[PDB]
């Protein structure tokens, strides 16, 4: 990607190729190099994303109402997933599971829990992606503590399976 | 939020609460206003959200993957969900088909084709979620011409129901 706008010497402005545009503050990234040059990735620090707030309307919630440690919670936890998987899983459940793990603990302080009623089937009929779930689980609440019963286990197992691009090992 | 940091009368950085490091982009942000000061919602043009190299290994290619037109379209598909059930879901539903409806073109141009094996059992289980469902992908193959079989509407549809507050209605 290049570099189109320039606020200053370390911040400068992005516009990737897929029609977003990006602040990356690095050190001394418009020093030494020019607009249209590709982004040097050595020098970035931080990067910042664009949100069109005419458009991006929920998708702002996203970015604004999920805490950073939760998110560094779904983004291991489907690590995990994906170290045992040995896929690049689809994004979807990353995003899922940071709002699913704070609905989760509202849910669990609601006293509620939610069943998929899908369950007696998936158990048998998703056996491996299931077991990874729990693993992932066993994660969860050895990490945070937020322990989901095998219904919402099974949720994500659906989620896993959707996010398993082409079963081939 | 708070504007804590400014580069320039229209660009000002945030810090917000969940530790995140917003740089909004409008008119006469920092103009006359003050750090620590609120930042005006009238004069919010443009925002960006943090994005760190280190932290966001997937929750990258989210924000970097999504085209603004399938960000749309997605935001589209749960305005009319919403429309239909009333119910404000969960944020997780409107980033997960942005990369869902992406993934399944993909999906469909890679003749990964996933029947849902569940889908028997969640005719009768899952009646109104998956209708709405349904409706929504004619909507989605309506104006866009990305069209999905039930099955993968099915898995839409457990992706509506982990976006669910349950029927509370």
């Given at each position: 990607?290049?570099?189109?706008?320039?606020?200053?010497?370390?911040?400068?402005?992005?516009?990737?190729?897929?029609?977003?545009?990006?602040?990356?503050?690095?050190?001394?990234?418009?020093?030494?190099?020019?607009?249209?040059?590709?982004?040097?990735?050595?020098?970035?620090?931080?990067?910042?994303?664009?949100?069109?707030?005419?458009?991006?309307?929920?998708?702002?919630?996203?970015?604004?109402?999920?805490?950073?440690?939760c998110m560094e919670v779904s983004e291991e936890i489907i690590s995990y997933a994906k170290l045992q998987l040995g896929k690049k899983l689809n994004d979807?459940i990353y995003v899922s599971l940071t709002?699913?793990i704070?609905?989760?603990?509202?849910?669990?302080?609601?006293?509620?829990?939610?069943?998929?009623?899908?369950?007696?089937?998936?158990?048998?009929?998703?056996?491996?992606?299931?077991?990874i779930g729990?693993e992932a689980l066993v994660m969860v609440?050895?990490k945070?503590?937020?322990?989901?019963?095998?219904?919402?286990?099974?949720?994500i197992?659906?989620?896993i399976?959707?996010a398993?691009?082409?079963?081939?090992?």
């Amino acid at each position: 990607m290049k570099i189109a706008k320039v606020i200053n010497n370390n911040v400068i402005s992005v516009v990737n190729e897929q029609g977003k545009e990006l602040v990356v503050m690095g050190r001394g990234l418009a020093f030494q190099k020019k607009s249209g040059d590709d982004v040097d990735e050595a020098r970035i620090e931080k990067v910042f994303t664009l949100d069109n707030k005419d458009v991006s309307e929920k998708f702002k919630t996203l970015l604004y109402d999920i805490p950073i440690e939760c998110m560094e919670v779904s983004e291991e936890i489907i690590s995990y997933a994906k170290l045992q998987l040995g896929k690049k899983l689809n994004d979807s459940i990353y995003v899922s599971l940071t709002n699913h793990i704070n609905f989760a603990i509202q849910r669990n302080q609601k006293g509620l829990d939610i069943k998929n009623a899908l369950l007696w089937e998936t158990k048998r009929l998703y056996k491996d992606e299931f077991a990874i779930g729990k693993e992932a689980l066993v994660m969860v609440k050895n990490k945070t503590g937020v322990s989901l019963p095998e219904d919402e286990a099974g949720f994500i197992a659906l989620h896993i399976v959707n996010a398993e691009l082409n079963e081939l090992q």
